[PDB]
Structures are given as C-alpha cells and as structure tokens.
Scaffold this active site. Structure first.
Site, PDB file in Angstrom:
ATOM      1  N   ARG A 155     -50.043  38.282  36.796  1.00 30.26           N
ATOM      2  CA  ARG A 155     -50.767  37.261  36.041  1.00 30.26           C
ATOM      3  C   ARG A 155     -51.433  36.346  37.050  1.00 30.26           C
ATOM      4  O   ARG A 155     -50.751  35.753  37.880  1.00 30.26           O
ATOM      5  CB  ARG A 155     -49.818  36.486  35.123  1.00 30.26           C
ATOM      6  CG  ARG A 155     -50.515  35.593  34.112  1.00 30.26           C
ATOM      7  CD  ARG A 155     -49.540  34.976  33.096  1.00 30.26           C
ATOM      8  NE  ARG A 155     -50.238  34.194  32.058  1.00 30.26           N
ATOM      9  CZ  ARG A 155     -50.016  32.906  31.773  1.00 30.26           C
ATOM     10  NH1 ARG A 155     -49.095  32.208  32.424  1.00 30.26           N
ATOM     11  NH2 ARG A 155     -50.707  32.302  30.809  1.00 30.26           N
ATOM     12  N   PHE A 167     -55.574  27.805  38.189  1.00 30.03           N
ATOM     13  CA  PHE A 167     -54.233  27.461  37.741  1.00 30.03           C
ATOM     14  C   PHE A 167     -53.170  28.042  38.700  1.00 30.03           C
ATOM     15  O   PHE A 167     -52.536  27.292  39.452  1.00 30.03           O
ATOM     16  CB  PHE A 167     -54.050  27.944  36.292  1.00 30.03           C
ATOM     17  CG  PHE A 167     -52.728  27.611  35.677  1.00 30.03           C
ATOM     18  CD1 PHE A 167     -51.915  26.615  36.189  1.00 30.03           C
ATOM     19  CD2 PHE A 167     -52.301  28.312  34.563  1.00 30.03           C
ATOM     20  CE1 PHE A 167     -50.690  26.336  35.592  1.00 30.03           C
ATOM     21  CE2 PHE A 167     -51.092  28.039  33.972  1.00 30.03           C
ATOM     22  CZ  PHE A 167     -50.288  27.047  34.487  1.00 30.03           C
ATOM     23  N   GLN A 213     -49.058  34.452  39.585  1.00 29.19           N
ATOM     24  CA  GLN A 213     -47.660  34.695  39.268  1.00 29.19           C
ATOM     25  C   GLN A 213     -47.256  36.116  39.641  1.00 29.19           C
ATOM     26  O   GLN A 213     -47.960  37.070  39.359  1.00 29.19           O
ATOM     27  CB  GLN A 213     -47.363  34.446  37.794  1.00 29.19           C
ATOM     28  CG  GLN A 213     -45.914  34.643  37.429  1.00 29.19           C
ATOM     29  CD  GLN A 213     -45.562  34.113  36.054  1.00 29.19           C
ATOM     30  OE1 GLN A 213     -46.238  33.245  35.522  1.00 29.19           O
ATOM     31  NE2 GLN A 213     -44.471  34.606  35.491  1.00 29.19           N
ATOM     32  N   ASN A 249     -39.844  30.510  34.664  1.00 34.17           N
ATOM     33  CA  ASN A 249     -38.625  30.563  33.889  1.00 34.17           C
ATOM     34  C   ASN A 249     -38.948  30.698  32.406  1.00 34.17           C
ATOM     35  O   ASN A 249     -40.132  30.648  32.024  1.00 34.17           O
ATOM     36  CB  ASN A 249     -37.723  29.349  34.172  1.00 34.17           C
ATOM     37  CG  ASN A 249     -38.312  28.046  33.706  1.00 34.17           C
ATOM     38  OD1 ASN A 249     -38.740  27.907  32.561  1.00 34.17           O
ATOM     39  ND2 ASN A 249     -38.334  27.067  34.594  1.00 34.17           N
ATOM     40  N   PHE A 269     -44.472  31.413  40.969  1.00 34.53           N
ATOM     41  CA  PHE A 269     -45.912  31.267  40.996  1.00 34.53           C
ATOM     42  C   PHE A 269     -46.377  30.421  42.162  1.00 34.53           C
ATOM     43  O   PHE A 269     -45.664  29.538  42.658  1.00 34.53           O
ATOM     44  CB  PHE A 269     -46.449  30.749  39.669  1.00 34.53           C
ATOM     45  CG  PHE A 269     -45.876  29.423  39.221  1.00 34.53           C
ATOM     46  CD1 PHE A 269     -44.663  29.369  38.579  1.00 34.53           C
ATOM     47  CD2 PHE A 269     -46.587  28.244  39.398  1.00 34.53           C
ATOM     48  CE1 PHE A 269     -44.150  28.155  38.151  1.00 34.53           C
ATOM     49  CE2 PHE A 269     -46.096  27.047  38.960  1.00 34.53           C
ATOM     50  CZ  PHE A 269     -44.875  27.001  38.330  1.00 34.53           C
ATOM     51  N   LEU A 329     -45.785  20.502  34.873  1.00 35.53           N
ATOM     52  CA  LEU A 329     -44.640  21.361  35.143  1.00 35.53           C
ATOM     53  C   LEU A 329     -43.522  20.625  35.868  1.00 35.53           C
ATOM     54  O   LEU A 329     -42.427  21.163  36.007  1.00 35.53           O
ATOM     55  CB  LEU A 329     -45.086  22.567  35.967  1.00 35.53           C
ATOM     56  CG  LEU A 329     -46.135  23.470  35.282  1.00 35.53           C
ATOM     57  CD1 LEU A 329     -46.446  24.651  36.164  1.00 35.53           C
ATOM     58  CD2 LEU A 329     -45.644  23.940  33.911  1.00 35.53           C
ATOM     59  N   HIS A 371     -39.980  23.183  36.175  1.00 33.14           N
ATOM     60  CA  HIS A 371     -39.950  24.323  37.088  1.00 33.14           C
ATOM     61  C   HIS A 371     -39.549  23.809  38.454  1.00 33.14           C
ATOM     62  O   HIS A 371     -40.025  22.772  38.901  1.00 33.14           O
ATOM     63  CB  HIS A 371     -41.325  25.007  37.156  1.00 33.14           C
ATOM     64  CG  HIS A 371     -41.736  25.607  35.860  1.00 33.14           C
ATOM     65  ND1 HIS A 371     -41.552  26.941  35.567  1.00 33.14           N
ATOM     66  CD2 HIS A 371     -42.291  25.048  34.754  1.00 33.14           C
ATOM     67  CE1 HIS A 371     -41.962  27.173  34.336  1.00 33.14           C
ATOM     68  NE2 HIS A 371     -42.407  26.042  33.819  1.00 33.14           N
TER      69      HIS A 371
END
Length: 163
Positions: A54, A59, A62, A101, A112, A121, A125
């Site tokens: 991904r 952004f 991942q 997660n 990521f 986040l 995270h």
C-alpha cells in the site's frame, strides 16, 4: 548506540536503491528490537523478499506483511501481536517509521514510512524510527503508488539487514 538497518528496494525486480533507518531503541526498545530482528531474519522469518503493498502518495508507504502480502498478515518476534509500548515519539513529518495496527495493542510486523506529517496518528501508532539515508529512494517508491494505495509496479525488499 541506536541500531541502523537497511532495505535494498527493487521495482519489478530491478534495483532502485537503498534506504537506511535509525531505530530508536533508546526510547522504544521492544518495538525497535522487533523491527531489527525482522530485518536481519535472525529468528528465521522476516522482511527479506516482502513487498510494500500500500503506497499512497502524499501520505505513506506501508509494508511488512510477509505472510499474506496484502495487509492482512504478519507477525512479531514476540508472537502474533504485542502491546503499544509507549507514544513518546510523534509523527512529525516525512521519514518517520511507525507501526501499523488494527486496534489497541495489536502490533505485528506491518509498518509504514510517512511521506507527510501525519499528526492525527499521534497516540494511536507507535513511532520507533526514522529514515537516515535514502529519503530520495522513498520519494522514488512513492511515485509507484496511487490514491487507493495500489501499486503500479511491484515494490519489494530485495535485501535487508543491519549496518
């Protein structure tokens, strides 16, 4: 001294370049150690050969799902999942390395690399490292992503280990 690990990245099997990471073992030792060991493969499983499944430009990138290759798998060196160690470090900008997660205390192997500041986040995270060398290579990877995260070429960790 904080460990440094490297990923050699390939694109449809063709070498792209190397990204290295400082892992913040001084502040999140349990989380840093998981990533370190998965990167050397010393437990018998790990990141070598796995893909970035991904990638969303602007952004994040991942990866880390070495069992199902699509975001549904992975496991830590402590078992299927482990707790959120702490949230001392924040998502301050590009280059931050943080755990993926699926709820509280569900860390596995997925992670990521941020390519933007992702402050929403923070506290959700666990941040545990940062790009040290090769941010340019992360930027090149990012161009193979798309809005929905699908990649236009296969982006793999051809080799990895500790420097």
């Amino acid at each position: 001294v904080n460990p440094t690990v490297f990923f050699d990245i390939a694109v449809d099997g063709e070498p792209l370049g190397r990204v290295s990471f400082e892992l913040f073992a001084d502040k999140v030792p349990k989380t840093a150690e998981n990533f370190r060991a998965l990167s050397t493969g010393e437990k018998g499983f790990g990141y070598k050969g796995s893909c970035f499944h991904r990638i969303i430009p602007g952004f994040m990138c991942q990866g880390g799902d070495f069992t199902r290759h699509n975001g549904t798998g992975g496991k830590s060196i402590y078992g299927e999942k482990f707790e959120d160690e702490n949230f001392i470090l924040k998502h301050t900008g590009p280059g931050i390395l943080s755990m993926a997660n699926a709820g509280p205390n569900t860390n596995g192997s997925q992670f990521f690399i941020c390519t933007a500041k992702t402050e929403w986040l923070d506290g959700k995270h666990v941040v545990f490292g940062k790009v040290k060398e090769g941010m340019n290579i992360v930027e090149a990877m990012e161009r193979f992503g798309s809005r929905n995260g699908k990649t236009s070429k296969k982006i793999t960790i051809a080799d990895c280990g500790q420097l």
